[PDB]
Amino acid sequence: HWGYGKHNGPEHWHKDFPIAKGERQSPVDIDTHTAKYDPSLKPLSVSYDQATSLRILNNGHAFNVEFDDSQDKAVLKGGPLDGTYRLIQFHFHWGSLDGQGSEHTVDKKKYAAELHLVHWNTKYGDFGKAVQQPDGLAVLGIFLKVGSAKPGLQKVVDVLDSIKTKGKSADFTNFDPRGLLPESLDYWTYPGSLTTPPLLECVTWIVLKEPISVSSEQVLKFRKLNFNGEGEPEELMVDNWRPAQPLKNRQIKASFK
Ligand SMILES: CN(C)c1nnc([C@H](N)S(N)(=O)=O)s1
Numbered sequence: 001h002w003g004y005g006k007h008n009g010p011e012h013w014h015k016d017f018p019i020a021k022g023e024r025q026s027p028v029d030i031d032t033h034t035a036k037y038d039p040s041l042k043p044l045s046v047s048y049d050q051a052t053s054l055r056i057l058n059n060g061h062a063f064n065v066e067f068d069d070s071q072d073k074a075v076l077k078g079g080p081l082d083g084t085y086r087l088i089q090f091h092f093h094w095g096s097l098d099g100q101g102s103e104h105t106v107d108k109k110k111y112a113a114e115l116h117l118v119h120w121n122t123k124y125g126d127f128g129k130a131v132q133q134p135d136g137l138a139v140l141g142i143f144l145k146v147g148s149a150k151p152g153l154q155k156v157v158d159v160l161d162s163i164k165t166k167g168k169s170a171d172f173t174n175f176d177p178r179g180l181l182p183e184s185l186d187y188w189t190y191p192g193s194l195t196t197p198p199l200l201e202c203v204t205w206i207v208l209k210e211p212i213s214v215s216s217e218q219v220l221k222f223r224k225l226n227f228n229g230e231g232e233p234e235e236l237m238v239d240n241w242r243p244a245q246p247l248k249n250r251q252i253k254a255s256f257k
Pocket residue numbers: 091116118139193194195196197198
């Protein structure tokens with residue numbers, strides 16, 4: 001089935017998922033000179049004080065940190081969004097080398113990695129109904145560059161040893177996602193899609209301008225994960241990013257001047 005290799009990677013996905021060649025696919029290159037400041041955008045509200053993390057899982061493609069989304073505990077509102085979007089999970093995309101790994105690019109620059117905080121619109125009642133709607137999801141994207149360590153990431157780094165292979169999970173309670181955010185909430189926004197199969201066109205993307213810094217030792221621990229299952233020959237989990245897709249009939253808006 002699908003993956004990131006030569007025989008099952010992004011250039012093959014359209015045969016099972018024809019929407020791969022659709023009109024609102026993600027990620028995209030963000031041309032900073034072309035993006036325009038939008039005064040109609042409302043301030044942006046990240047409310048993560050009552051977040052309840054539960055578990056961390058290796059799915060064969062990336063790892064997910066999952067949250068209790070049975071009540072409004074950790075929500076995203078404001079900015080381009082109408083209504084309330086509940087945090088369900090976060091994950092990353094990363095490279096084999098420090099000069100590649102992000103999905104979005106900025107003036108064609110690739111970062112070492114990209115964090116995705118995935119949220120669903122509570123007017124649709126559950127995540128599976130939300131992904132069938134054009135405004136069903138909001139994904140907050142944050143770039144990672146290599147330099148100083150991120151103290152708030154270290155708890156994630158230290159549990160990766162326990163989920164090395166596809167299908168493994170571990171308890172991950174009391175993790176505070178506020179420790180993964182940069183100082184500034186300045187952002188770019190556009191309508192797009194999931195970046196993995198089934199590639200559904202259901203996402204409002206909100207991509208922060210300020211990257212977070214992580215250390216070379218933190219990213220090296222991501223690159224020790226495996227795509228394969230336990231007992232199978234080793235295929236390092238690296239380069240699990242989709243490249244930039246055609247912008248087509250879309251405008252990227254900026255929250256800042
Ligand atoms: C469960 N669903 C559909 C998804 N889980 N992670 C997904 C992606 N990896 S992204 N990048 O958020 O579209 S898509």
